Ligand binder design. Structure first.
Ligand SMILES: *[C@@H]1O[C@H](CO)[C@@H](O[C@@H]2O[C@H](CO)[C@@H](O)[C@H](O)[C@H]2NC(C)=O)[C@H](O)[C@H]1NC(C)=O
Ligand SMILES: *[C@@H]1O[C@H](CO)[C@@H](O)[C@H](O)[C@H]1NC(C)=O
Ligand SMILES: *[C@@H]1O[C@H](CO)[C@@H](O)[C@H](O)[C@H]1NC(C)=O
Ligand SMILES: *[C@@H]1O[C@H](CO)[C@@H](O)[C@H](O)[C@H]1NC(C)=O
Ligand SMILES: *[C@@H]1O[C@H](CO)[C@@H](O)[C@H](O)[C@H]1NC(C)=O
Length: 199
């Protein structure tokens, strides 16, 4: 009656919570697919694209911690179900990542356009993703009035590289910071100044 497992697990994912690890997880197979009273998981992984053979470990838990990784690098991951009668299908491959670090990227100014005495348009260049040290989640635009300390800020998505700042006091000097952020946190701030005209 017993046979090899019917299917391999779904929802394979690799994500670090430290720069030196990657946690591989998956949905345990439903018992009807074990074809056996126990099932284990053959986990294979390697840094993406290396001729070196796959690292491999068999576990019964639906997760595996890969340690001693470089910071935010891609890994190829295969998870095959196995039991005493044999192995599931040849598995599909998922890309996972070791853990994120703070970005090193610092946004560069494209321009600050003065719109009115109460509004400006801030434009920056898209950061280089290789310096994000993680998945780019957005930008944070911090600004405050010096005069002419309450600090305001505007969070935009990762796809967005300008923002209008409204409700500014007229004839005032403002400081402005722009930071990229990933899942770990924000990078260093590029630091700018602008003045609103009279009103
Ligand atoms: C945008 O910048 C603000 C500060 O201008 C950041 O605010 C901090 O958020 C953390 C949560 O991760 C809090 O623990 C701190 O107390 C906050 N500090 C201040 C001074 O507000 C905020 O993290 C940034 N937003 C994003 C999405 O990175
Ligand atoms: C990271 O995830 C692993 C696996 O779940 C866990 O053992 C470890 O405690 C986690 N570390 C932190 C700092 O949350
Ligand atoms: C960390 O990874 C390196 C990768 O080159 C490997 O050679 C070594 O086994 C690991 N070192 C430690 C101290 O865990
Ligand atoms: C200032 O410019 C902003 C941004 O375009 C706009 O929403 C607002 O209506 C303008 N204010 C005035 C008084 O024209
Ligand atoms: C990126 O661009 C468009 C317009 O802002 C938006 O519909 C899309 O959802 C954005 N992405 C995210 C993750 O918000």
């Amino acid at each position: 009656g017993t046979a090899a497992p019917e299917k391999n697990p779904v929802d394979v994912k690799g994500e670090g919570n430290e720069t030196t690890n990657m946690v591989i997880t998956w949905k345990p197979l439903r018992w009807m697919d074990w074809n056996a009273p126990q099932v284990q998981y053959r986990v294979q992984w390697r840094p993406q694209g290396t001729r070196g053979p796959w690292q491999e470990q068999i576990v019964s838990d639906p997760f595996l911690v890969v340690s001693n990784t470089s910071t935010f690098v891609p890994y190829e991951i295969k998870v095959q179900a196995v039991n005493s009668q044999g192995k599931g299908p040849e598995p599909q491959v998922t890309i996972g990542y070791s853990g994120e670090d703070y970005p090193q990227a610092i946004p560069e100014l494209e321009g600050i356009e003065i719109l009115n005495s109460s509004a400006v348009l801030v434009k920056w260049r898209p950061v280089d993703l290789a310096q994000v040290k993680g998945h780019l989640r957005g930008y944070n635009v911090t600004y405050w009035r010096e005069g002419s300390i309450h600090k305001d800020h505007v969070v935009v998505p990762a796809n967005t590289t300008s923002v209008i700042l409204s409700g500014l006091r007229p004839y005032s000097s403002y400081h402005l910071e722009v930071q990229a952020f990933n899942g770990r946190g924000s990078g260093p701030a590029s630091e700018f100044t602008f003045s609103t005209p009279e009103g």
